[PDB]
C-alpha cells in the first residue's frame, strides 16, 4: 500500500500510494428537534421554597433566550342473710362494670388519637413526599428525554451558534448515513463517506438556524467531494548542500491529481488522513502542472522552475517523514541515528541521508534529538466499582395481629353468651 | 529577562531573552477507565411509567454505541319484695354488660380497620416511595461516580473522537505529571514540563481508541521536546521608506543545533513568561547569517526576504513590549498614553515606542492599542442554598401512660369481680 521514496538528488522524501477526496461543494440539511416539555404539577410539596420543576424550565428558557439574542323460721332467717350477701356481691359487680367502662373509654379516646395522628400528622407528610418525588422524577426525566436537545443547546452556547465537527448529538450515525444516501454523488463516494464518517464529521459544520422554546432547528453542512480515488502523495524536504552553497525545496505538503493537473495543499490543516485515505479542501489550493513532479529528481529541470531557498553557509537539520526521517548533516555538526535496543547504530558523514522507522528509533543532529517513532509509554488504568441500591421493604405482622383481634371478638362472644345464661335464669 | 531591541535600519523589533522547547517527538500512553455500573433493582416505585435507572442506562448505552460507529308471714312477704327488687337490679346490670360488649365490638373492629389502613393502604405507598428514592439516588450516584467517564464521552462525541487540548477529565494533573516523569527525557525537561502543564496540555492530543459499555480506552498523545533552553526571539517588521521595503520573515526564531530554526506560522509557538514551545514539524532551517538581516537589508551574506512598493505606505505593528510605527507621506501619526494625553507626533520615518510609556498609537484615522485596555469589572452574586428537614415525632410517653391507665382500670375491674365471687362462694 503506502510506501516512501527518498530522492538524494534533491534531498526529499515522497510518500506514495494515497487516494484522494477533494471537497468542492457543500450539502445542507435542515435538522429540527422538538422539546419533551414538562407540565408543572401544582400541589403542596415537601419544602414550599423548592420549586424544582419551575427552576429547571427557567434554566432552560434562559439558555434558549441567550441563543435567540445571537441572531320453719330457721330457713327464712338464713335466706335473709343470703339475699343480703348477693346484694353486696351485685354492688361490687356493678363497680367492676363501671371500672371496665372507664378503661374502655380511655382506650377509645387513645384509638381516636391514634387515627388522628395518622390523618392529621402523618398522612399529609406522606402526600407531600409523593409530590416531591414526583417533581424530582419529572425533572430527571426532562434531562433524559431531552438529552440531545440539551447537548445541542450547550454546543451552540459554547461556540456562539456554529460548531465543528458535527457531534453525535447534532447528527446521529443513522441520520448521517441517511443524508449521505441522498447526496447527488456516485455510489463510490457514498460508500467512501459511509466508511469515513469520522473524517466526514470533522469536515462538517453545524449552524444554528431557528430557536424557540419548544423547538430547535439548525442547518447541518456536510462536505461534497468533486473527485475521489486519484493518487496523492506527501512531500518532505530537508536542506541540501555541497561538499559552498545550500538549497532547500520550499513546496512541502500534500499533492493530489486533479483533472489532469496537480492540486497542491501547502497548509497542513486542510488535509485529513485516515489510513491510505486523504481528504483535502480545494478552497485555498494551488493548481500546478504535472511537471512539478520532475522537481523530485531534478532541480534544474527545464520544464518547471523548482521553488527553492538558498544559503551561502553550511546548514544542518532533520525532518521527520511518514515512514522515517531525512537527515542533513553538513559542516562540523555531528549527527547520529540511534535505536532503542542498540543505542547509537550509525554516524552520519557530510551529506543527505534517509532513515527508515523500521530500524531506527531516534536521530540526533547536533544537540537536538529527533524522534523517528512515537515513544510508547506508561499504561494508565482507572478502576470502577459497582453501585448498589439498598431497598429494604416495610412489612407488617398482619396475620399475627388478626389472630389477636379474632381472640378479642371470641372473648366478646362468650361475654354475651354468659349474659344470655344469666337472663335465661331470670325469665329472659 | 525579556527585552526588545529596535533596528531602525531595517525597521524591525526583536524580542530577545526567551528559552526554547522544540517538539520533535510524541509520547503516547494508553489510559483506561472502568464504569461504575448500576444494577437496576426491580420493584414497584411511585410511577410505574418512570423507570429512571433504565432510562439512564439507555441514554448511556446509546452514547457508547454512537462513538463505536465512528470506528311470721310478714317477714317472708318482705323477703320476697327483696328478691324481686334485686332481680330487677341484676337485669339492668346485664343490660349494661351487653352495651359495653357492643361498645367494645365496634371499637375492636375500628382498631382492626385502623391496622388494615396502615397495612394495605399506607405501607405499600411508603415502600413505593422508598423504591423511587432508591432509584433516584442510584441515578445521581451514577452521574457522580462516573463524572469523569461521562465528561470524556461528551468530549469524544462533540469532537468526533479526537480532542485537543487534553482536558482535566481526560488526564488529571497527578496523572499527567506521572506520565511526564516516565518520558525518556532529562530531569531538566521533566522539571520544565511539570512546570508548564497548561502548555503541555495545549500541545497534546487525545484519541478515542476503544469504547465498550463497561470500559473506555483512549490514547493520550503528549509532546516530546528534542532540545530546550536555547535562545529564542520573535521578530516583528514594518515598512521602511525613503520606494518602500518590508521584511517578510516575521515570526519566531530559535537556535537549533548550530543553525537557526524559523517558525513561520504564529499558531505553532506557545509562550508562557520567558518560555517558548515551538513545533519543528513545518519549520525552516536557516544559517546564522540571517541575523544580519536585522541590521542590514542588503547584507552580502544572506539575501533577505523583502517586499517592495513604489509608493509611500504607513502602518503600525504592535510588538510584545511595544510597537513599531511607520509614518511616511502625508499621513499623520501620534502616540498617546493610558490617560489619552498626546505625548508624541511622528514625522516622516520609522520609529519605535515602548508599551511602558505609550498606550495607543494613531496612524491616520486608524487607532492601534499598544496595551490591553482594562475595563469594567463584573460580579455575579450567589446565596447559600438551605435544606429544611423537619422530622415527624410521636408522643410515645403520654400515650403509654394512658395505656397503663387503661390496664389499671381493667385490673381493678377484675378485683371487684373477685370480691363479688368471694361473697358468693
Amino acid at each position, epitope marked *: 500500500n503506502i510506501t516512501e521514496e527518498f530522492y538524494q538528488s534533491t534531498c526529499s522524501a515522497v510518500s506514495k500510494g494515497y487516494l484522494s477526496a477533494l471537497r468542492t461543494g457543500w450539502y445542507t440539511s435542515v435538522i429540527t428537534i422538538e422539546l419533551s416539555n414538562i407540565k408543572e404539577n401544582k400541589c403542596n410539596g415537601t419544602d414550599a421554597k423548592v420549586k424544582l420543576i419551575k427552576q429547571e424550565l427557567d434554566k432552560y428558557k434562559n439558555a434558549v433566550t441567550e441563543l435567540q439574542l445571537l441572531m320453719a323460721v330457721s330457713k327464712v332467717l338464713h335466706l335473709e342473710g343470703e339475699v343480703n350477701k348477693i346484694k353486696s356481691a351485685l354492688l361490687s359487680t356493678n363497680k367492676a362494670v363501671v371500672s371496665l367502662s372507664n378503661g374502655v373509654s380511655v382506650l377509645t379516646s387513645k384509638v381516636l388519637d391514634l387515627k388522628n395522628y395518622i390523618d392529621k400528622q402523618l398522612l399529609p407528610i406522606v402526600n407531600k413526599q409523593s409530590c416531591s418525588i414526583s417533581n424530582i422524577e419529572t425533572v430527571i426525566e426532562f434531562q433524559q428525554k431531552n438529552n440531545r436537545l440539551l447537548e445541542i443547546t450547550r454546543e451552540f452556547s459554547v461556540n456562539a451558534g456554529v460548531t465543528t465537527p458535527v457531534s453525535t448529538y447534532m447528527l446521529t450515525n443513522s441520520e448521517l448515513l441517511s443524508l449521505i444516501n441522498d447526496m447527488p454523488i456516485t455510489n463510490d463516494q457514498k460508500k467512501l463517506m459511509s466508511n469515513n464518517v469520522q473524517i466526514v464529521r470533522q469536515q462538517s459544520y453545524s449552524i444554528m438556524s431557528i430557536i424557540k422554546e419548544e423547538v430547535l432547528a439548525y442547518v447541518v453542512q456536510l462536505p461534497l467531494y468533486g473527485v475521489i480515488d486519484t493518487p496523492c502523495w506527501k512531500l518532505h524536504t530537508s536542506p541540501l548542500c555541497t561538499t559552498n552553497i545550500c538549497l532547500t525545496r520550499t513546496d512541502r505538503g500534500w499533492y493530489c491529481d486533479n483533472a489532469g493537473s496537480v492540486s497542491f495543499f501547502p497548509q497542513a490543516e486542510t488535509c485529513k488522513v485516515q489510513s491510505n485515505r486523504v481528504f483535502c479542501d480545494t478552497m485555498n489550493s494551488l493548481t500546478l502542472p504535472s511537471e512539478v513532479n520532475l522537481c523530485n529528481v531534478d532541480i534544474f529541470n527545464p520544464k518547471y522552475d523548482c521553488k527553492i531557498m538558498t544559503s551561502k553557509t553550511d546548514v544542518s537539520s532533520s525532518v521527520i517523514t511518514s515512514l522515517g526521517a531525512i537527515v542533513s548533516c553538513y559542516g562540523k555538526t555531528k549527527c547520529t541515528a540511534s535505536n532503542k535496543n542498540r543505542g547509537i547504530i550509525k554516524t552520519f558523514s557530510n551529506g543527505c541521508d534517509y532513515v527508515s522507522n523500521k530500524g531506527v528509533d531516534t536521530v540526533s543532529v547536533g544537540n537536538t534529538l529527533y524522534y523517528v517513532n512515537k515513544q510508547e509509554g506508561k499504561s494508565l488504568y482507572v478502576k470502577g466499582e459497582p453501585i448498589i441500591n439498598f431497598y429494604d421493604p416495610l412489612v407488617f405482622p398482619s396475620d399475627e395481629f388478626d389472630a389477636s383481634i379474632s381472640q378479642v371478638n371470641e372473648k366478646i362472644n362468650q361475654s354475651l353468651a354468659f349474659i344470655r345464661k344469666s337472663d335465661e335464669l331470670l325469665g329472659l | 529577562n525579556i527585552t526588545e*531591541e529596535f533596528y*531602525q535600519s531595517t525597521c524591525s523589533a526583536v524580542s530577545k531573552g526567551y528559552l526554547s522547547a522544540l517538539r520533535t517527538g510524541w509520547y503516547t500512553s494508553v489510559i483506561t477507565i472502568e464504569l461504575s455500573n448500576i444494577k437496576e433493582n426491580k420493584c414497584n416505585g411511585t410511577d410505574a411509567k418512570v423507570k429512571l435507572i433504565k432510562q439512564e442506562l439507555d441514554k448511556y448505552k446509546n452514547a457508547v454505541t454512537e462513538l463505536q460507529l465512528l470506528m311470721a308471714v310478714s317477714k317472708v312477704l318482705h323477703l320476697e319484695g327483696e328478691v324481686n327488687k334485686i332481680k330487677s337490679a341484676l337485669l339492668s346490670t346485664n343490660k349494661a354488660v351487653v352495651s359495653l360488649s357492643n361498645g367494645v365490638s365496634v371499637l375492636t373492629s375500628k382498631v382492626l380497620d385502623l391496622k388494615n389502613y396502615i397495612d394495605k393502604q399506607l405501607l405499600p405507598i411508603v415502600n413505593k416511595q422508598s423504591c423511587s428514592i432508591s432509584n433516584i439516588e442510584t441515578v445521581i450516584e451514577f452521574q457522580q461516580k462516573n463524572n469523569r467517564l461521562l465528561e470524556i464521552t461528551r468530549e469524544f462525541s462533540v469532537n468526533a473522537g479526537v480532542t485537543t487540548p487534553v482536558s482535566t477529565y481526560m488526564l488529571t494533573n497527578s496523572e499527567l505529571l506521572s506520565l511526564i516523569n516516565d518520558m525518556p527525557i532529562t530531569n531538566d525537561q521533566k522539571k520544565l514540563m511539570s512546570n508548564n502543564v497548561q502548555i503541555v496540555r495545549q500541545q497534546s492530543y487525545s484519541i478515542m481508541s476503544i469504547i465498550k459499555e463497561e470500559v473506555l480506552a483512549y490514547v493520550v498523545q503528549l509532546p516530546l521536546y528534542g532540545v530546550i533552553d536555547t535562545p529564542c526571539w520573535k521578530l516583528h517588521t514594518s515598512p521602511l521608506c525613503t520606494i518602500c521595503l518590508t521584511r517578510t520573515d516575521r515570526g519566531w526564531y530559535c537556535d537549533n543545533a548550530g543553525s537557526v530554526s524559523f517558525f513561520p506560522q504564529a499558531e505553532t509557538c506557545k509562550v508562557q513568561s520567558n518560555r517558548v514551545f515551538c513545533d519543528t514539524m513545518n519549520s525552516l532551517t536557516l544559517p*546564522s547569517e540571517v*541575523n544580519l538581516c536585522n*541590521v542590514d537589508i542588503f547584507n552580502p*551574506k544572506y539575501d533577505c526576504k523583502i517586499m517592495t512598493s513604489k509608493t509611500d505606505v504607513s502602518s503600525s505593528v504592535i510588538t510584545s513590549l511595544g510597537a513599531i510605527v511607520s509614518c511616511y507621506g502625508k499621513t499623520k501619526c501620534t502616540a498617546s498614553n493610558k490617560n489619552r494625553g498626546i505625548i508624541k507626533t511622528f514625522s516622516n520615518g520609522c520609529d519605535y515606542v515602548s508599551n511602558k510609556g505609550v498606550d495607543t498609537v494613531s496612524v491616520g484615522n486608524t487607532l492601534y492599542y499598544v496595551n490591553k485596555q482594562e475595563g469594567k469589572s463584573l460580579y455575579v452574586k450567589g446565596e447559600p442554598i438551605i435544606n429544611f428537614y423537619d422530622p415527624l415525632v410521636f408522643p410515645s410517653d403520654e400515650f403509654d401512660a394512658s395505656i397503663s391507665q387503661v390496664n389499671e382500670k381493667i385490673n381493678q375491674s377484675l378485683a371487684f369481680i373477685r370480691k363479688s365471687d368471694e361473697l358468693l362462694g
Partner: antibody
Amino acid sequence: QVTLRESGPALVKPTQTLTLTCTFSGFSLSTSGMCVSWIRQPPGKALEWLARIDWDDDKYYSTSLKTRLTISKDTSKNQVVLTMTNMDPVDTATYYCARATNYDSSGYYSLYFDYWGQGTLVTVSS
Amino acid sequence: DIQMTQSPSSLSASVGDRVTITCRASQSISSYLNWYQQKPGKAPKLLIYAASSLQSGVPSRFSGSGSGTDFTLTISSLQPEDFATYYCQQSYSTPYTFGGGTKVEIKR
C-alpha cells in the same frame, strides 16, 4: 592556540608604499565565520579600524582611507596582507592584525576581535 | 560614520573601588558593542562582547551592560593590575569604530 603575528618594515620613507603581513595559526580563513581585520594606533592615541577580509573574500575598508588600502588573503600560506600607499609621517602608528568572529546566538551577528597579534610598529621618516 | 563617546577620559580610584565607565553611540546600535582592555605596550584584549557577554578568561569582576545608545563597563573591585586604557567598539555599521579611550590609573 590561536595566534597572530605581524611582519613588515620598521621604517618607511614618505610617499612610499607600506606592506604588512599577518601570519596566523589555530584557525583558517577557509572556515566560514572566520574573519581577519587590521587595526592601527597612532602613538598615545585611539585605535583605528582599517580593513577586513572574510572567508568568502569579502573586503571592507575605512572610508576616508579607502583609496590607499588593499587587503588580500592567501589561505594556503595562512597570511593576510595589507597595503597602504603614499605613507606619511602622520601614518606612523602601531599596526595590529586581529581575528574577528561573529556572535551567533539570539538573532545577533556582532563581530568582535577575540585574538590580537602583538603588533608591529611602522615608523615613517626620511 | 557611527561615533563612540567614552566617559570619563581619565579616572583615578583606589584598590577595591567600584569603577564605572560609560560609552555612548551616535545612533542606536542594539547590543553590537564590545569592550577592550589595553595594558601598556601590549595589544588590546577582549573583555566584553555583545554589550554584556563576558569573554572566557577575563575575571568575573568585569561586567558589561546596556543596549541601544548607552553602554556601561564595570569593575566591581578595582585591582593593581587593572591599570590600562579601556576601549568600547561598535560592530553595527561597516566602518567599525572605537571610542576615545578611558585611561584608568590606581590611587595608592
